[PDB]
Amino acid sequence: KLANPAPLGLMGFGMTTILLNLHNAGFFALDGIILAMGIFYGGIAQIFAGLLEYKKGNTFGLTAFTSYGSFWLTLVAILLMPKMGLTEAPNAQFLGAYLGLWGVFTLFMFFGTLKAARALQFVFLSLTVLFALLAFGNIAGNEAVIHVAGWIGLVCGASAIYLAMGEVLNEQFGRTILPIGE
Amino acid sequence: KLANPAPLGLMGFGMTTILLNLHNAGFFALDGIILAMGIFYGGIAQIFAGLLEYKKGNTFGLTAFTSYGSFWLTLVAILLMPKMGLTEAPNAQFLGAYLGLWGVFTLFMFFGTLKAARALQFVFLSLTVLFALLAFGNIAGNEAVIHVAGWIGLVCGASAIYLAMGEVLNEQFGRTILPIGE
Amino acid sequence: KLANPAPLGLMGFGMTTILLNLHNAGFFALDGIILAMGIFYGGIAQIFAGLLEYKKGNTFGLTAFTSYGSFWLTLVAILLMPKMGLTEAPNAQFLGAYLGLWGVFTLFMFFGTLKAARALQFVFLSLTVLFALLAFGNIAGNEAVIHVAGWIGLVCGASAIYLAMGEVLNEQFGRTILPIGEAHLVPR
Amino acid sequence: KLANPAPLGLMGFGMTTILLNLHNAGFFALDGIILAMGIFYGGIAQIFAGLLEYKKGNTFGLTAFTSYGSFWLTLVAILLMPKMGLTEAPNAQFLGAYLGLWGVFTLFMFFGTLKAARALQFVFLSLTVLFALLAFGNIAGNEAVIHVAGWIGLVCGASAIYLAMGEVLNEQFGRTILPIGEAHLVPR
Amino acid sequence: KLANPAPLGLMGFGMTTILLNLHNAGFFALDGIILAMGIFYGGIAQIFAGLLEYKKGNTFGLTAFTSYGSFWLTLVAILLMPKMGLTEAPNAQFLGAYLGLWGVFTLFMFFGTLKAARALQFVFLSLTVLFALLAFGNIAGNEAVIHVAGWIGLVCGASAIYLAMGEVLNEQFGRTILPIGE
Amino acid sequence: KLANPAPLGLMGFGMTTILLNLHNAGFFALDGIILAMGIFYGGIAQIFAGLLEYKKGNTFGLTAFTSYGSFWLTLVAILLMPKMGLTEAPNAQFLGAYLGLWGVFTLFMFFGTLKAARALQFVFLSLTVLFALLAFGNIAGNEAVIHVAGWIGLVCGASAIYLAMGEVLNEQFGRTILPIGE
């Protein structure tokens, strides 16, 4: 059988999500830490994980990991293209619409997890909320909502890491080490 | 047994199409958000989706996704090469010709969808109209036509997202959740 | 059963050929539009089409698409590297020699299409003429020849798009929708 | 029968870990040597090793190598992007948080090695300690903790190289040349 | 069966070899024409052709095309790195030693073609001579020898194109259209 | 039935090794020639050769070629990043440690070759000595030792080219043309 690529994808998503949202929560400025993780781990590694779902027959995983890997690359390009003299910093309402579209994608995909493990359902539920809060905060110009999105993002990202490690450990031992609501 | 890559390609197309046409409908200036999405999601991710149709034996999909993924990359390059000092701003009538060719491609391909899902037919019909109106708009320098094109693009993009999530959810549940006319 | 990559390659070639030759025919200056298309569609997408011919066992398509995809990339690089301070602007006679070699390649490959669809023969015949005229035009500094070449290029590019869409539609419907002059029982 | 990619991944990880922690232990400044190795060997080569685990059915190795290859790339990018004018220099507490998350990942993965070779358990145990100490050191601004972490890192890196070469030699000779504590009949 | 990648490799090699050596012969300065062809066709396309020889079981082709594809990329980097402020223009004696090493490689590989088609033997014989002349010319500082190498390079490159097209046409028609001394 | 990729990797290693050590033996300054070869032939092509050993079931080769290909890329980056304004010139004692680690790797791998061709054993033994002498040389700042290392490197590189062409020619003729102790 082929390896399970989902833990790779979940880890890249989860760790990067936590780091971005430590900034959104207001602990840190928008550091190169986030941008670096967005490029290689949330971005490129997650895209690998999505592509690896193809031969596994997993349409959901292919769609999800490759899309959110692409999300991270788009976010980093949005943030860095002004540093390169290519564009201006984005209009925050337009950024909100973009985050909103990612939220709508996530909401539909959430309904797709309802016949899957509860842990995965929670990843997509909290991710839907995260995008919705980030979309609102940017469209309304409400920094308090962004701060709260940040905290939600910490839980979202942590839950993805939990799921990833539950999948690795449960496979390694051939039993439920970490329950993921299978 | 291979995964379905069409939702990936349709999502990349659909999201990026909506974002471009929020600018065309007159809500926002064109900034990095559109370009970032054009590079990585409407562009590269859609190209991945096209190449993944090869082993699925799907010529239409290989042709459509890889081409429209290429389209997004060409449009982004057209708009950023002037910022890089490599070219000057594109000629609008020339750009109109370029858009018209993409429209002609889309019209031929629309007749290809008559054998496929009704929702896919709507995507290609509305996409044909979108390219035609953006072509006329740029050639004739008619901003009112671009604006109408914008609204058509919002509907086109949304319909693509609808079909993508229909495909994912109908496969996840093993039954028609969202009717797409298949 | 693997997908047919030829329409992709033909589309990338055809669209890009048309845009370039709108310039050659004198309608527009050489624009970012041409360069962008040369990089990604005439270029990279056509290279993908060529590589996809390998597992289909199609030596001719592997050779053709990957080569002409490379042509488009070399052409964009010739034009942009001076903007990057990497090179000086190209010598016109040397450009003519380069176009001439692409022409010679195309002439030989044309003979490889004699058993293939008529529409594909037309693509390679007009392409041979297109390269020969561009080669002469640049070597001899004859703008009128370039303008004629431009028109031939529009026809060439358009015939490739026609062939691409015929292959797609004919496969989608499981019968001939757009006649492309497939060889059947009549000997070539 | 596919080759074993683990020695490649372990070597890239191990060498790069040693060089970084020669800096952490206070022997050298943070040099291009570390960054170069982080990009290509700890980084890209380790990513190749991870991807090669997919067809071997090895979820643990796919997850581990591709993740820690990405770690090395993110670390080099954090350090070089300010030189490129793309970002400002990293916040030390935020770097500590990042190192801490890598530490948490490593701790969970350590438990995944309990049925694997003892030498691999040692690699993941020392790596967990290594990340925890680097995390604390940066968060608390304690140089002494960083220096201790550095020494632990030399041991960690060295044990990975030992394990890599054991796997290579033991396979080459078809028997144990370097004991790595493979599980056999004794229950774990 | 898998496609034959040799004509691709031979074409990329052959066309690029002709263009470089129109300069070496003294017709033209060392134009971007050559550098562009060296990057994408003599370089990258030829590397593809080499990699495609792997599943064909062809050790000779894998070794030859991938190596000479790499040759072209090294030559272009040598020529462009000074334009990028990275290095000085190369020491010509050192360039000669480098060309000499490529000549030695080519000489051994020539002996490997002796049980293969005569046309291929001539490609490698003329290529050996080409490198030897370019090596001498640069080490001795003799521009006349470089000029003659240039002319030899035209014949070498043309012979590779001839072989490539002989392989394509002979396969297309299932007979000897162009004789290649099989 | 897959092609043998070892000649490719050995050639990339061998040529680039000879060129580097013409500088170390004191004939030339280090210029773009070495760096170009380090990037594309000693580097990338050797990496290709390593990855191609995977499906051949050859762990030693996957490990050796991909690692030494990576080595060349790291050395080139070390030397060019200062020219790019990204780092300062490397610390020689640090560089010595780095070279020593590569030597330690090479020594372990040498014991791996005792099961393989005698010519390959010579490549790894001489490579072990080369790394050891370059390490000592840089650490101790002893230029005489670097010089001796240079000559050892010329012999090491040449032996690699010999083995590569032995492998190609012995396979082409189906018999031992160049004895390599297999």
Could you give a short description of this structure?
The structure is a homohexamer. With 182 residues, chain A is mostly helical.
Oligomer: homohexamer
Q: How many beta-strand elements of chain A? A: 0
How much of the polypeptide of chain A forms β-strand, as a percent range?
under 5%
**Category from helices, strands and their pairing of chain A:** mainly alpha
Order of helices and strands of chain A: HHHHHH
Q: Give the count of structural domains of chain A.
A: 1
Q: What is the makeup of the main sheet of chain A? A: none
N- to C-terminal distance of chain A = 21 Å
The coarse silhouette of chain A is globular
> What Rg of chain A is obtained from the alpha carbons, in whole angstroms?
16 Å
Largest interface: A-D, 42 and 47 residues
Compute the number of helices of chain A: 6
Measured as a percent range, the helix fraction of chain A is over 70%
What key phrases describe this protein's structure?
homohexamer, 182 residues, mainly alpha, 6 helices, 0% strand, globular
Secondary structure layout plus pairing:
The structure is a homohexamer.
Chain A: H1 6-25, H2 32-52, H3 59-80, H4 92-112, H5 118-140, H6 143-173
Helix pairs in contact in A: 1-2, 1-3, 1-6, 2-3, 4-5, 5-6
PDB class: transport protein
Keywords: organic anion channel, rectifying, unidirectional, dehydration, transport protein
Assembly: hexameric
